[PDB]
Every structure is written in C-alpha cells, then in structure tokens.
C-alpha cells in the first residue's frame, strides 16, 4: 500500500492503483451492493472529461500539454481500458462526487506514467463541478443508450412482427375476448397490433428526448455557473455532440432545473416502463399461442431453445418487464425527493435507468431473432376452429332464425364439425338459403376482413 | 319500483330511474366499491352515442326520427343533466359494457318521453360493440382531460412562478446542496427552476397527444370493423372534433392495438407521474422555505388558510395518490389478452382521477400558495452573507499564487477568505477594501 | 342557506348543514377530489369522540351534562346516521385537523339540537390536540375493517375453495408448467393450493394486527401527552375495546412513533398486497380454466352473471389492481413524514380503507357467485390426461423410451389415448399386460391424491 | 477453451470451467443483463444439493461413494469456493431450472477430479426436478439472509439509536409538527421514536419467517410429488436444520402453492419495503437536523467521512443517510417488481422465480450492509447541539401556555408576542412587563416554563 492524502487527511491505497485517496475513502465508506459503475457510465465520464480538457484548453484556461494529457487519458478511459480503477459502491454520496473525483484521480495517474503532473481537481475539474458533472454523465450514458441501442432493437423487433403480420395475412382463426371465442381474425392482423405496441414504443423513446438529452454542465456547485466561464455549457456540448454524432445532447434550458431535479430521467423510465407494459402482452400472447401440445391452445409452435419446447423467451421477457417496472419505481421514489439546488439520488437514479435500457434493449433483439422470426402457425388447425365455432353462426340468423341457428351451434360443439357440416346435416339448405348463400354467410376470412 | 321482464325473470328498478333491466342486474352483480362513473366518463359516453346515430343517419342505417331521439338524449347527458341515470360499479366487467349498456338504456328512456321508440341493442348501439365504445368514452375524457383542463391549470402555475422567479430576480440567499451551505444563489432562480419543471410538464403532456387521442370506435368486437360501416371510426370521429372542439382526437394508427391494448392511458398516466414528482420537489422545498418561524429556514412567508403549509400538504398528497393511481394503471394495461384489455372501467377510473386531482391541486397551489408568497430580503441576505466564499474573484488583484495560499489558510484556520485576505495584510494598493467588497459581493457571486 | 361569523369574517354553510364555519372554510380551501372521509373513517371518529367524553367525564374535567351530550351524539356518528355531515375532501391538511373539526362542530350541532351547548374545541375536542385524533380514528378504522370485515370475507373465501377442493379431489387433469403440458394433478389439488393461499392471507392479516391496532390518543400535539391526563391513552383505549369488543385496540408501545409515522398502515397495506397478489392468480387461473367454448381449455364451466363472459374474475383483477395502487401510494405517504408528524394521513386512510373495503366485498361475490357453482367438465378432463404424451415415461421400464416416445407421437396424432394407442401399436403381449399398462397409466394415482 | 457434445450438437466451454453444455447453451441464450447468481444463491443450490444426496443415500436409492462425492462437492459450493462457475444471466427460464442444471454441472465436474462418475440429471438430481429445487433454494437463501444478517443488522442499528435515545434523555428541543415550531420534546424522544421503528421492522421479519423458510422440496414436477419418496421434503428440511442451525426452515404446508405461487416472497419484500419506509423518516430527519451548519437547522454534527466538494473546500455532507435513502429507493422498486412477477404465476408453477429472487436477496443485501454503516459510522458519532436547543425551547411561544392560570391566556399571547418581536427568552419578556409580584413569585415562572417538565421525560 501507498499514502495518498485530502483536505482530510491521509489514506493507505493499494500500491498498484490507479485511484487515490478520495477514491479509497469511498470504497470505505459504501461497501452496500459490491456494484460499482456499468461501462457505458465509465465511458460516459471519459468522454465529458475530455470535452471539458478541450474546452479549457479552447479557452486558454488550461496548458495545451495538461489539455492534451487529459484528452488522452480520457480516451482510455472512453474506450474501456480502466474499468478496473473504478471500485466505488452505486450506493455513494448522492451527488456523485465520489465517482467524479475516482475519474479525475484515475486520469492524473495515467497522465503521471507519461510524464505529465495534472492535479485532479485543479486540472482534471477545471470549470467543473461535482454537482454538474455526474448528472451530465448520467444523461449522456442515457441519451446514447436510447438513440444508439434501444430504437435500433426496438425497429429490429418491430420488423420482425410486421413480416409475421405480412406472412399470416390469411392465417384466418378464431378472435378472444375476455378468454372467450369471438369473431374471426387473422394472425397477421393479431401481429400488426404487436409491431403497432413497439412502433408507439419508439415514438415514446423519441417524445422524451428532447428532455432527457438536456446535460447540466457549466452550472458548477449550485446552478449558477460560478467558477466556470458563461459558455462551458455550450462549448462543451458541441464538442461532446461532434465526438458521439448524438445531435440530441443539448445544454440544459433552465440550469438551476438541471440540478435541482433529475425530471428527464422519470419522464424517460415512464416511456420504457410503458414498453415493458407493450412487451409483456405480447410476450403473455406468443407464449399462450404455443401453449399444448394437447391440453393447451396449440396455435403456433415456438423455435426450440416442436409443439413442447418451453416459451423460454416469453418468461425473459416478461422477467425483463418485471424489473423495468421495479426499476421505473424507484427512479420516481429518488426524483421526487430533491432538496434546493440538487437532487442527491442520482447513483441511485442512474443505475436504474440505465439498467432499464440495457434490459430491454438486449431482450427485444433476443426474442425478435429467436422466438419471433422462427413461430411456425398451424394453419389449417387454426381454420378448421373458426369454421367450427359458435361465434360464426350469427350471419345465418336472418335465414334460419335465432333458434335454429342455436341449435346449429350447440350441434357443431357437440359432434365436433364445422358450422357448415352442421347447417347441411341439419337439412337446412334449400328450404332457407343455397350453399351459394350459406359459403358467403360463412366465409371466416371475410369475417374477419381480410383479403 | 317498477317491475320489468330481463330474459332471466323480473327486475324490480326504482321509478325516477331511467336505466332498465340490464343496467339494474350489473347494480346487483358489482356491490364492490359503491362508486360509479364520475361526470367526465358520463358526458364522453354522452358524445359517442349522439355522434354514433348522426353517422348511422348519414349512412342511412338509422331512421333520421330515431337519430333525432337519440342526438337530443345524448345531448342531455353530454350537458350533466343525468349524472344520477349511472350508478353502475367502477369495478364491473373490463370492457365496460355494463356502462355501455347503461347508456343505451338511458337514452331509450329519455327518447320514450318524448314518444320514439328505441331499441337500446339494435338503435342506440347500433354499428358498434360491447367492446369498441366504453375504450372510445375512456379517451374521449382522458383528452378533453389533458387538452381543455390541466394544460391550461398548469399554465396557471408557471405563470405564478415564473412571475415570482422575476419578482425575486435579485433576493440573494444562501445556496443548499446536501441540505448544507453552498454558495448564493437568488429566490428568483430557485422559482426560475420550479417553473421549468411545470414548463417541461406541460410539453411532457403535449408530447402523449398523439396516442392519448386516438379512439377505438369502428372496431367493433375484436378491431375487425365488422358489422360496422368502413368508415364508420372516421367519420365518428370527424362529428367528435367537430362538437368538442378538440382536433387532438383520431382515429387508431392500428384498430387491433386500440382494443388488445390501453398503452396510451399507460404513456399518459407516466407524463402525470412526472409531473407529481416535480410538484412533490416545488412543494417541499415551499414548505421547508416557510418552517419556523424560529425552529426553521424562515426565508418565506406562506399565505395563512404561525401558518401551516397546508396547500404543501395537499400537492404533496395529491402527488402521491398520481403515484399509487400510475401503478394501477401500469398493472392494468400489461395484463390484457388477444383482442381484448378487460381493465379498462379501473384503469379509467385511475388516469381520470390523477387529471383531476393535477388540475385542480395546481389552480389552488397557484392561486391562493404561490401568488401570494412574501420573501423575508433581509433575512435571505444574512443567509447568503453566511454562506461559503471562493478566491477565484481575487485572482485578478493578488494572483493564482496568493489566492490559493489565501484558501489554504481560510480552510486551515477555519476563517472567511474576507477576513483570512485582511489577517494576512494584503490591503493595500493591489487590493481595496471597496475591491475586496466588490470581489466578494454576494448578489455578484449569484452571477443573476 | 344560513350564515355564521368566523374569526376571519362571515361563512354561508347550508341550512340542513350540522358543521360549522371551520368545515365550511376547508371545503372552501380544499376543492381537489370532491370526494370525503368514507363511512368507516366518520364512524371511529364517532366511536373516538364518545370514547373521549367518557373519560374526561370519568377523571371529572367535563361536566356529565355535556360528557352525555357528546356521547349520544357520537354514538349517531358511529351509526351511520350523519355521513353527509362530512363535506371536507381527503386531500386537506396532511393531519386531519379539518376532519377532526368537521367531528368536533357536528357533535355539537347535534347537542344543540337537545338543548346542550358545547364548545367544539373546549369541550368535545377536551385533552386531545389536532394531531392525535384523526391518525388514531384511521387506526380504529382499519382494525375493525380487517377484524370484523376482511378476515371473516376471506374465511368465506377459503371455505368455497376448500368446500371445491374435496367435491374434486379425484377430477384428474392435466399438469401444467410454462403453460405446456406436464404429469396429472387433481382439479382438487389445485384448488387446495389456492385455498391455502387465502388462509395464508388471513395469517399475514392477523400477523399486522400487534401494530395496526396501536392507537396515538393521549399524545397530543408531538407525542409527549402535554395537556392531556397521563393515563388518558390507557383510558380511552379500555373504553373503546369495552364497547367496540375489539381487543386488537392498544395504546402505541412508543407515542413518538405513533405520531411521527403511521408504518402500522404501511405494513397492513402489504399485507393487503399480497392478498391481491394471491387473487390474481387464482381469478386467472379460473379464466383461463373457463375459457372457450371451443378454442381455449375448456377444462370448467363459470356461473352465468360455457360462453359465460368470467365477469367476476375481471372484478377480482381490477380491485387486486386497485389495492396495489394504493398500496403505492401509501408507501410513499408512510416514507415522507417530518420529525414529530406524518403528514400524509388523509390520503394513507382513504387508500388503506379503500383497500380492504375492496377486497372485503369482491372476496364475498367471488367466493358466492362464481367458486361455489363451477361446473368441472369431468370426463373431457381425464380423456385429454389419458392422452398426453406427459404421461408415457412409467411405459419405459416395459417398451423403450424410444417406443414410448412413439406412442406418445402417435397418440397426439390420432387423438387417441396412450392406452389405445399401446394395444393399436401390437405392444400387448408377455412384455406388457393389458393389467401392466392400466396400472403404468393410471392417471389418478399419477396425481397421488389423498 | 475445451469441446462438448451435447444432443443439439458441439459446445466450446472456457477451460477452467466446471460447468458443462446445458450451461454453455443458457449463456449462449441469454446474453440480457451480464449478471449472474449472486454468493448466498449459489451457496443455498449448495447446501440444497448436498441435503438431497444425504437423503438418497439413507433411503438406499444413491451409491454410498456417489453420495459421498456430491456431499463433499456441494460443501465446496456452499463454503463459496465456486462463486465463478454460475455464469447464467438471472434473466433465464423462469423455474430457474437453466441456474439447477448448472449447479448438478459443477458438482458432477468437481466430483470427476477426484475419479468419481456423477450423471448431472440421474445422480445429483435424483429424487428432484427442474421445479422445486430453484424455489426451495431461493427461500433457504432468503431465510439465511433475514435470520442471520438483517435481523442482527437491524438490532445493532436499533441499540445504536437507543443508546443515543438514552445519552439525549434531557436534551430539551422544540417539536416541529408540518415543519412549523411546536411544544417541546427532546432529542432523546426523537430516537426513541427512531429506535421503535427498528424494533418494529425486526418484528415484522419475524412475522414473515412461518411462510418464508417453506420450502417447496419433494414436491417435483407439478406438486404431486411423483418420482420422488413420499417423505423426502421433510428428509432434506431435517438434514437442511441439522446442518444450517436455521430452525425456521419448514415443509411447505400445500405442496401446489409452494410451487404454483411465490407468496412468501411478496410477503417479505412487504416487511422490507416498510423497513425502507422506516429508514426512509429516520435518515431524513438526522440530515434535518444536521444541516447547516450556518444556513440550516444544525441540531446535531454528523461524523464526517469524506471532503463534500473542491469549489467549497471545508463542506462536509450527510453521506450516509444519502446511501440510507438510495437504498431505501431501490428495496421499494425491487419490492413492487417482486409483487409483479409473484401475480403473474399460471396453474402449477410460478415462473418468475430468478427475477424475484436477485430483487429480493438485494434488499435484504442493502439493507443489512447499509443497516450496520448507519448504526456504526453515523449514529453511533452524533453529537448534539445541547445549548442552542435549549436556547430555542426557552424562547418559542409554544411554552407560554402554563402562565395562563398565573396571568390569563391573553396576556401569556402578549408575552410570546413580545418575546418573537424582540428574540428574548419567554422567562425574560414576563420580567420585562413587571408580571412577578402576588399571583407569581421568580421561581413559581421557572416552574411553569420548565421546558424539560413539559417535555414530559419518564
Ligand atoms: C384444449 O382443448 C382440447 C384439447 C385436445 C382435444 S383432442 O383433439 O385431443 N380431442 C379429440 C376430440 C374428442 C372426440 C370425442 C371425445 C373427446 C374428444 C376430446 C379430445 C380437444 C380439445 N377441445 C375440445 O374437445 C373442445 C370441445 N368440443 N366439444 C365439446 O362438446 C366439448 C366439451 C367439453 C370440453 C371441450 C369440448
Ligand atoms: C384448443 O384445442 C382444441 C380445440 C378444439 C378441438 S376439436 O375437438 O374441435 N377438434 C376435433 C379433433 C380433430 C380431428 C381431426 C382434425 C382436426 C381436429 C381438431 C378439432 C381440438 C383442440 N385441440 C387439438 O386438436 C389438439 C391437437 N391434437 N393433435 C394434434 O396433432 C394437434 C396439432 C395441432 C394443434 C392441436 C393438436
Ligand atoms: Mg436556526
């Protein structure tokens, strides 16, 4: 071990670290979960330290040799090389401080092996604050989880749904509501509603971007941007949006609601919160659909991971929902209970929102490669219920009269035939209607408007 | 307390009621919660069935002297007159055709007075199902909801703070993070803040629009359209807009969606939740400006209804109540099946419910909270001239090299950098007291 | 329409009005729900105000005049009689003091009446503050709901599931797991399961009552039972269990507590929670068991309110919805009190009180008009067990998985059962007696059923 | 890396793996959150594994020498030797059968180094299925984690808080009801009140643990119990008591709802969402009371841990109740998707199992963990602010009350009223309008505005 010191004193470190003595204090103070920071969150404090280095460096705040150490330490940093050097709990200071000091610690010691002396915090958080820069890096982590990663999954299992929506366009069947036999409908038109629920999901994910791509920095301690010049907020977003191409990071439209409350991150968890709605019925219908292969519905057959496999990824995907949904309740509890001038839940916050995308983003292209894109339907199975059930029989009333046509259906259920079969041995073609009339009466797939 | 025929025997129904038999056996089978649709839910069921028979008279399904009875009646319970005609559970069979049927008997009662008669089924349903119309009414309320009443409440409120925001532009304070001292900001700034989050609340309701409007109706039993005209759902509709005023309604993107699925009650009632987290944030921080007077912060004065933050209270209840509501509408609309969401008379009941309490709790926050807040300005300057100093404004004066021994020395000493400046001589013609004073200004250090 | 003079001015309160201008001030100031205190809620503050009188009568700080007065007074609260004296909306000061007041001036509106004057305040409100009243008539409210109301609806519950899990212990059935097919079980043990469920529901109920019992009368205004007797606690809770019989009523083990937070009600929602958790699953498993008449399982028939719509399952869904809403929302109000006072109290009544309302009323009709009349469709249900392919392993040790594994294709292609299939197959013979394979598929004790 | 075969064809498995093809496949087919079992998980598939083969060797349906094997293999798992060798996602099939199959891996590999044969299914998974044996490992997880670590946990914070309780007996404070000055208390009350909050969250825990430690164990496939011995449930719950000392651990009252449902779950995620609910208050108020210290409240001084920020250099910042309250956050997010999955089970199993496992073994984690942080590195260091109290107390209008026998109640208010106006004691405005002569005597006012009297304190 090394000695490493603070404002408070000193601190024994693992002699290899690459972190110091505020690092090693929290590591401390918060052993709660043995979770430290995701990837995408240390990348995210990479890539905002090398736009600030940048920015001051542009400014003439900071020597180009302190700038240019900075940037590439960052870089590392950003490209997943220090993982390691990040041991601090989720569960720290609410601020994140503690996470934002381990960054600036880290970088110093990557700089000090190639000669270069850079302070932590008088270099490494120059213009900054720890107020400012978490938040910035959570809502950078979250931006690019949505845009990069979520929609492109989200439109890989939209397309899934609508070429089944396509390919069961005629795959006529009998319609449930309340569990109960109702009119015809097709497959194809039963999946034209699931890429709608995942279409709408996307829209939602896009609807809260302008919000939740809104980055504090430049507000320094408390809002007001004392300590750092009047435009770091914009230098430093346009240099973060020509490095990540995310035209969606925007300087925050109000600095002191930036800081105060964490509002985008709420209003983007109640967007994946109402995917994980979308997804659980769909995945609840798919896996009802397999369901047999004797006593159940026995509707499609699910890829094997036939007619007996498991609905393997209906159960992660419903488990998913679950999570999303607890996940979602917890980024509401920490938004609601900020105090002045910061929201002090943002590890909190942060874990859980990125945890959400993560979750959902993984599942959706899962089960659109290997459950949707391989269900096989029984087709034939499916026509022969819906030409068989009780709930076709209404169109013939007008020709053989509400009794009759009763006593057609209770017949048809009870011998196990077809409603024509049953109107034919009946005896009733000729006396009310033709077979002419009785196939248009009876055309399911008619029925159910398709084509 | 007439007797009537229902083919599963007689049905004894009070004599004032215009509901009939089915309307009366859902009274007897849902004794559950013993409280029905709220007036919003009547008007919009009101809306469909007299736009309902105006297109079925246009297409010339319905006789123009039923269609007439009909637009007359729904009028009547669209207007409020027949709020006491629904006594039928909130919790009642999840596609809402207790309710439905609820309206048909209704209107064939109100028709019969004036001497046509309707068939409640086969006239007032006519084109529609036991499954299209109760999700139609439910978004029906839900937009008028969002677009007529809480945007315009919440408006109310950012005015109110934003108005304070100006006010207060320049009542320095101490600046709170972690509940501890931080350097100054204004009250303006804070209420700045506040306001910016019913801002973004507003554009987070407006943002659901698209989805929250758009109706099921001409989708009969399972979203096929059948037994129901082609164009049935858009020309309903086109008469909805029409009368309503509001463009925002719409036919379903995808008829199967509007009827397997209530996401867009889901997607709304997160926009409310988020707007109770914002509220739940602005009022607290209210109640705890106003503590005291002597044991507390003491920087505010609220309107007395020693005063108690009582409309604080109220917002930070109401937000908790969005929150229990949101999670019953969550749990409702991911358990839907097939062609059919059977949660919908409870998810209704829910996202309504949090419409209303948001609106109204903001209008009185608003008006008789926020208006009429007093600042104590001598108070909050004491405040902000105890809070922590930097030596970033001497570095100009002394340099980079004297200011950070002067913030060494002030962290060490556990002395002010104004003092710790004086202690260490450094008056003099490099640096003024007026220069010193000027430096370190707090209102200056708000950077307003 | 009559008029009244405040310490602020005049206030018009309806003639047929018993409150006073505190009341009409609140409903003044509070127009957010349109909805006030529910029956149960405006009977224990009845019950506590009479409780109240009779020990500052008891202790001689109130004339027995008026003592009398407020007794019979309360006693018509308790009853039911004045539900529409309390206009005040749930959503009012997070301490119930409006409704404590709106009690205060009805008891003595009503004494009026009788030719009894009493000052609401000084009298009816006597050793008690704004603080410990309304928290303690939210924690009457919910004892006597879970003790005389929700345990007694779930036993009735449990017994209709009982009362089906014996009438089918021997209606074998399939197994299911993931949804797919799996080895027999009885139609009873299924329904023994669910009944279960409930009496572990009536356990975690009974387990919440040591602290949803504790009430915080005597601690006045923090807690510490300034201007009030010492013993007023001990005393108002021994009347209130000598009259009520609810010996769950305790005084608070610790009066800060009781004061500071109301996490009995957090507690007893999740409880509450669970129960809701539970009916979900058997209210679905029901549906789902109903459903048909042709292409779902079509394993029971419900009761007509098999092309019955499952109304009462929806019912029972919705409401387990509804409670675990409110039991959010509870969560939230319990978490977010303030050194000496929870403020949240209003909105944690309304929600904890409508939650066992709720499930009090939706067990009873689920229990009475869908559990009892369930028809199970006997034969189909052991045709379809005879016929899985779930059920050929115990034919291994005689054919040959491979063989077995044969049959089983077979016999879902045919539709015909394993045991038709393994004598249409030619496998009867010295491997095999038609004896050895009726007890190798016999299904009943596959499901080894009592 | 080192090949396999399995019946759907050739797996490659990283070479210092004790896991074998069916563990391979899951990681192949659920690549969703990167996070696997957690320790207290893999150790109760451990001591489940080891009970099991216990039983099968005493009934005679297990070779002594295989027995042997898998108890010596599941002791190595249960002691924590092989937290590396469960690589599955939680987000697996949900009877968690894909985390039971890895387990019954693992110990037939360990087993095999030693020259013993173990078959995964026929052998380690005798007389058990791929349905009871993930449940009854999750309950005995849960049971070992509210018995032995929150349960001590919450009595150390508990003894903490009444200790200070005790310290700050007279510690005389205004009361603050709706954050506005009320009568007195002390600080003493204030955590006492704190203290029976965690005696009543251990009670609550206790009150879950008759349905938490049910195990569903002999149940098999459906509940039925077929393929397995009549009486091994309570065979493997006798050995699993032996040897854990866990006397909570039971068999399931009904064999169907021990499988088909996961109540006992949601009903201990309800005790400890209502912990949550109760820490929630408590670290709230002690940040209250320590803010500051010149712009807020400053009743107490929490200990400090850490520099709070570099632009404010000496602001030190309540970093505890800051965890306290984020873990507070995230037992109530877990606890409502706990009660999701445990709705959603359907006829004989519920299959959200590994779901609502990892979310309610993490509450009980962060709970105990930041339980024992609060309790030692916050509560423990708190020092109160014993003058400026008291100073407070012995100036608030609040007390003027107990002078109206002496001088009328509306001369009492014109005393209070003073007192604010001009920021004197109660004591010294009373002086200060000549009130003391006939109907009060000086020390017949000291009696009447004792503020630690009108506290009330035992
Ligand atoms: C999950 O639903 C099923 C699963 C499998 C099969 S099957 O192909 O394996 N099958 C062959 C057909 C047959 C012929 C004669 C006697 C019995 C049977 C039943 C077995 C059918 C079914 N449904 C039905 O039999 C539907 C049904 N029709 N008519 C009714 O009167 C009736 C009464 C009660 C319940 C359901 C029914
Ligand atoms: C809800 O499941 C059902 C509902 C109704 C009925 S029914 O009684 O109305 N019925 C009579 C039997 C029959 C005879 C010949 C051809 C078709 C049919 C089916 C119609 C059966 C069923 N289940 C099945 O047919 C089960 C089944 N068995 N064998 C398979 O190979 C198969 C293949 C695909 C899907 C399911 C199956
Ligand atoms: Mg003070």
Redesign the interface.
């Given at each position: 071990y090394r000695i490493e010191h603070?404002?408070?004193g000193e601190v024994r470190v693992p002699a290899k670290a690459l972190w110091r003595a505020?690092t090693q204090?929290?590591v401390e103070?918060?052993?709660?979960?043995?979770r430290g920071l995701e990837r995408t969150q240390i990348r995210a404090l990479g890539l905002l330290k090398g736009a600030c280095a940048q920015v001051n460096s542009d400014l003439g705040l900071l020597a180009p040799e302190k700038a240019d150490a900075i940037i590439a330490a960052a870089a590392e940093i950003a490209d997943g090389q220090h993982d390691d050097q990040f041991p601090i709990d989720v569960?720290?200071?609410?601020?994140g401080?503690?996470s934002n000091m381990n960054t600036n610690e880290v970088i110093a010691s990557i700089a000090a092996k190639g000669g270069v002396t850079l302070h932590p915090?008088d270099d490494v958080?120059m213009s900054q604050?720890?107020?400012d820069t978490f938040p910035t890096a959570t809502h950078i982590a979250a931006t690019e989880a949505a845009v990069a990663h979520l929609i492109p999954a989200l439109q890989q299992l939209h397309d899934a749904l609508a070429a089944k929506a396509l390919d069961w366009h005629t795959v006529v069947?009998?319609?449930?509501?309340?569990?109960?036999?109702?009119?015809?409908?097709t497959l194809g038109?039963?999946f034209?509603?699931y890429?709608?629920?995942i279409?709408?999901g996307i829209?939602?994910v896009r609807?809260?971007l302008?919000?939740l791509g809104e980055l504090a920095i430049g507000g320094?301690?408390?809002?007001?941007?004392?300590?750092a010049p009047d435009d770091f907020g914009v230098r430093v977003v346009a240099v973060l949006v020509a490095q990540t191409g995310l035209s969606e990071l925007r300087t925050a439209?109000?600095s002191?609601?930036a800081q105060?409350?964490r509002?985008?991150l709420?209003?983007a968890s109640?967007?994946l919160?109402?995917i994980?709605?979308?997804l659980?019925?769909i995945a609840?219908?798919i896996?009802?659909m397999?369901?047999?292969?004797?006593?159940?519905?026995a509707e499609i057959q699910l890829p094997?991971?036939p007619g007996?496999?498991?609905?393997?990824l209906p159960?992660?995907v419903?488990?998913?929902?679950?999570?999303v949904?607890?996940?979602?309740?917890?980024?509401?509890?920490?938004?609601?209970?900020?105090?002045?001038?910061?929201?002090?839940?943002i590890?909190?916050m942060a874990?859980?929102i990125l945890?959400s995308f993560?979750?959902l983003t993984?599942?959706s292209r899962?089960f659109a490669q290997?459950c949707i894109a391989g269900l096989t339907a029984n087709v034939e199975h499916l026509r022969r219920?819906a030409e068989?059930?009780?709930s076709i029989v209404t169109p013939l009333n007008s020709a053989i009269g509400y009794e009759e046509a009763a006593a057609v259906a209770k017949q048809a259920?009870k011998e196990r035939k077809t409603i024509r079969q049953t109107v034919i041995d009946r005896g009733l073609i000729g006396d009310r209607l033709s077979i002419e009339d009785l196939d248009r009466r009876l055309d399911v797939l008619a029925?159910?408007?398709?084509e």
């Open positions: 603070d404002t408070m505020q204090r929290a103070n918060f052993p709660i979960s043995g569960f720290q200071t609410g601020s401080t503690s915090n958080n604050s720890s107020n069947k009998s319609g449930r509501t309340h569990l109960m036999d109702a009119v015809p409908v038109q039963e034209s509603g890429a709608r629920q279409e709408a829209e939602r609807a809260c302008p919000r320094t301690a408390v809002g007001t941007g004392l300590n439209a109000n002191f609601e105060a409350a509002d985008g709420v209003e109640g967007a919160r109402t994980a709605v979308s659980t019925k609840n219908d896996r009802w397999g369901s047999g292969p004797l006593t159940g519905l094997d991971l007996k496999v498991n609905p393997v159960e992660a419903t488990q998913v929902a679950a999570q949904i607890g996940n979602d309740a917890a980024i509401a509890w920490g938004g609601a209970n900020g105090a002045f001038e910061l929201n002090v839940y590890p909190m874990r859980n945890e993560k979750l993984n599942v899962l290997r219920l068989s059930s009780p259920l029925m159910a408007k398709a």
